Amino acid sequence: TALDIKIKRANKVYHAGEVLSGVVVISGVSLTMEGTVNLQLSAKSVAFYNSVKPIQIINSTIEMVKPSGKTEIPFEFPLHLKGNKVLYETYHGVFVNIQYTLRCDMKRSDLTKTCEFIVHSAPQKGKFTPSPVDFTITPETLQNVKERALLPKFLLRGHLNSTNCVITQPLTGELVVESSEAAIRSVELQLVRVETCGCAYARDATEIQNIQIADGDVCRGLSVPIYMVFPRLFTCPTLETTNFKVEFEVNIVVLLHPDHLITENFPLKLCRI
Template sequence: MSIELRLSRANRIYHANEALEGKIIVKSPSSISHYGIRLSVSGSVNLQVRGGSAGVIESFYGVLRPVPILKKSIEVRPSGKIGSGTTEIPFSLILRQPGEENLERFYETFHGANINTQYLVAVDIMRGYLHKTLSATLEFIVESDKAELIERPVSPEMVLFYITQDTQRHPLLAELKSGGFRVTGKMSTQCSLSDPVTGELTVEASAVPICSIDIHLLRVESVLLGERIVTETSLIQTTQIADGDVCRNVTLSIYVILPRLLTCPTIFAGPFSIEYKVSIAISFHSELSKLHSISDPTAPRLWMAMETLPLELVRTR
């Protein structure tokens, strides 16, 4: 015997003012009696503070009280029987009724290191004390309502940057400091979640051969803990735009596709905030790099040059 939830949309993306629709699929070799079929939806922002981003006292708190967003349930069917074979039971539930007061605004689905915004739909088929309740849970994705989207277009302006041995705040190999290098480019610092992060980069000069050029997408999660704010920066993904010693004075395109569940619009809420950064990392050929394992690709290294830019993500019409 099995129970499954199947939503009407394959991508499972819904807006707060829409109806969550789908089917409850029950497969049973024989008919069963039940005391009601209940469907419930819930949404919350789950916060935590890890020991690596806070002190000993802060890490003692561990998981903080979640921020509730949504909690409601309906009875799909009253007490009765489900026949043998495969039975499909349709359901429909409006996430937010017009004029309905909610505990919080509907933040977009986001899976981070310390912040996790999640929406779940669950079904329970109650069978009494002698039988175990049949249950199934499925996550669905919430995006901003059309009324909350930014109407103005994303700014086409790009920020200019240049990377040399003099712009680095961490120690470099002697041959990098003496020989020198210069990399220039530009990149968009405001981007729609449905579009890639774009820009361009040019290696004008480098005395030491280049090994790789990578674009790191970073999230900056801040959680309010008591009277202080605990902030942690972590890596979302890395996109390599050059492999090997690139030709000088040739423009390289920057094109980074944003992962859906790991990104959401930039948020500044009361108990938490989510921001983003983009880091351009240039690795140079060095025998020293072969002796060290790369546990954190964003950590400063003697054979690396880096430049970090802020990135604002928005949801547009």
């Protein structure tokens, strides 16, 4: 008296046109494949934009067994959406969450289990052009003249290989601490999701992960390698639709010895090729 769903692919990723095939294992029963875009209302930023409501991507139900031992039964769905409705990338965000789930339920006089399968956006048409960016973290980067006076004199030079990043490829670059009067306690990368909901409109920025790249007083003139692996389901290609936007930024924050923090923001543009 127990159910389980086994999706054929180990990685459980399926593209916008493939076929979702698997086996349901037991020890009448139906199975429903539902994809949802859950948008969570937030603190107002700008008529209260009361259009932030769940969006159903896909709805498909199969009556699998009409009303012992280890039993297995195959199943399959076609991943198709009319002619213009796109299957959004799986995205475990905070205010925008795009999730595809299979739900198997068996009636009794009802045992249910939900298993999530990932959907990957189709590769772009393809003219991938990296956009290398050079930057200089200086005391003239903090957006306050009042605090800037207490900042020790520092100068860091860096080069991001591309702000237009392939999501399967890591963010690579170099950072050279040309000269810092105060000892550098830590330099870390901070991937910040920028999620927007509604129209003329709630916009939030939330940290996904922090990855420290420089610990302690690094040699002055040594190229510390900026390396960052994008998280699997917490990052998606930059998505824009009339109801919601999901963008991504990276914040290089330098920490100095007397608890001083300096932020440089680079808006990335993730894509799949």
